[PDB]
Amino acid sequence: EKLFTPLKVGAVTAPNRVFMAPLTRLRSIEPGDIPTPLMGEYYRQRASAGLIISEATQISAQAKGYAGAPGLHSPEQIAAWKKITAGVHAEDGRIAVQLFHTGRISHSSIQPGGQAPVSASALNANTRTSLRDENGNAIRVDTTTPRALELDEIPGIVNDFRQAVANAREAGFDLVELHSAHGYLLHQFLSPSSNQRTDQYGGSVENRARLVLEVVDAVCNEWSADRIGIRVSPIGTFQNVDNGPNEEADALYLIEELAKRGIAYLHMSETDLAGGKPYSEAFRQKVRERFHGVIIGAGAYTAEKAEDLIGKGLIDAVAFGRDYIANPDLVARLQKKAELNPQRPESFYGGGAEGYTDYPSL
Ligand SMILES: Cc1cc2nc3c(=O)[nH]c(=O)nc-3n(C[C@H](O)[C@H](O)[C@H](O)COP(=O)(O)O)c2cc1C
Ligand SMILES: O=[N+]([O-])c1cc([N+](=O)[O-])c(O)c([N+](=O)[O-])c1
């Protein structure tokens, strides 16, 4: 078995290939979107992971889509995240911050000034986001119709990603993961379904990938390419955002472009929680020959599926989501073939310690 063997991931070395997937838990303080000591304890409990990838973290106030999600733009956010990374490092762990802009998956009530969120085009996402009620409890509310970004606003978006990566370095993160998946802003530009622009940021695949590649170049320049990962979900449909009528060819174009930058890793979210068609081994081979860094697979994996694909030389590591919510010591349990704690989905979002830090270790 290979799941418990080391792997060099850009600038750090993971001691195993069992990674903690990015998981939105909506427990941050408002006002201020500030990480908490309870969040610090949760991440410290999981520090035996080969790599922790944080919950989605907004790059700016405009980037916020969910009440209770943290940011990485203000002094108070930087100071709170510094305590969290210090606690992970005290336990000999490694942690990446997942950075996003939600684009049209948002609501006017949590935007600056109470105004419309932004996107590639002015089309409603036709889904829900998570807000908080008068008592601070999580609630699902229909998304607000966005306005299209003006051409002259695009450099500011690139600069916000650049600044958030500068802040992540100061906060003591080991790596950053750019959120280019799941129907958020970068994916909204990538997909023809959500991008009807007639300037240089819409139409062809080269134009649709222009924004995400500008962001990759900016953050590599700010820090170093060996500190940068990216999450993509380029095959299937995710939160009403499909990948267009040429999804395989368009995915291989983007992956070839990413490879030119020499980034640390490519993280593929293979399916939505509601399911989708499995990746073919032929498509996995085409990805593998186009990218020369670490490849992480995710989406309803078991340890058995992970071992199979790692042994075949097609991926290098696996990110587990819901098994990591329920099992702080998932590495030890998989190594010893011990039974897992049962999941409690009712407490995935919002609340406090219950369903968060109260899943026991062996
Ligand atoms: C409660 C919950 C929150 C999630 N939040 C995020 C997120 O912040 N960013 C992201 O890229 N994916 C997010 N996902 C997807 C997970 O990263 C992961 O890909 C998925 O849970 C993997 O499948 P598994 O749970 O079957 O292992 C979330 C999933 C769940 C269950
Ligand atoms: O649980 N969620 O609300 C949720 C949130 C995010 N996110 O980045 O904010 C995701 O990427 C996914 N996701 O991919 O399933 C889910």
TrEMBL record:
Record keyword 4Fe-4S present: no
Q: What positions does the entry give for progesterone binding?
A: 140, 179, 182
Q: Which InterPro entries match?
A: Aldolase_TIM, OxRdtase_FMN_N, Oye-like
- Naturally occurring in which organism (per UniProt): Enterobacter cloacae
Q: Which UniProt keywords apply?
A: Flavoprotein, FMN, Nucleotide-binding, Oxidoreductase
Q: What is the protein's name according to its record?
A: Pentaerythritol tetranitrate reductase
Identify which cofactors the protein needs according to its UniProt entry.
FMN
Identify the residues that bind FMNH2: 22, 24, 56, 98, 231, 300, 321-322
Gene Ontology cellular component list: cytosol
Which positions bind FMN? 22, 24, 56, 98, 182, 231, 300, 321-322
Question: What does the sequence similarity comment in the record state about its family?
Answer: Belongs to the NADH:flavin oxidoreductase/NADH oxidase family.
Annotated NAD(+) binding lies at 24, 140, 179, 182, 322
Q: Name one GO molecular function term.
A: oxidoreductase activity, acting on the CH-CH group of donors, NAD or NADP as acceptor
Q: Where is the NADH:flavin oxidoreductase/NADH oxidase N-terminal domain?
A: 2-341
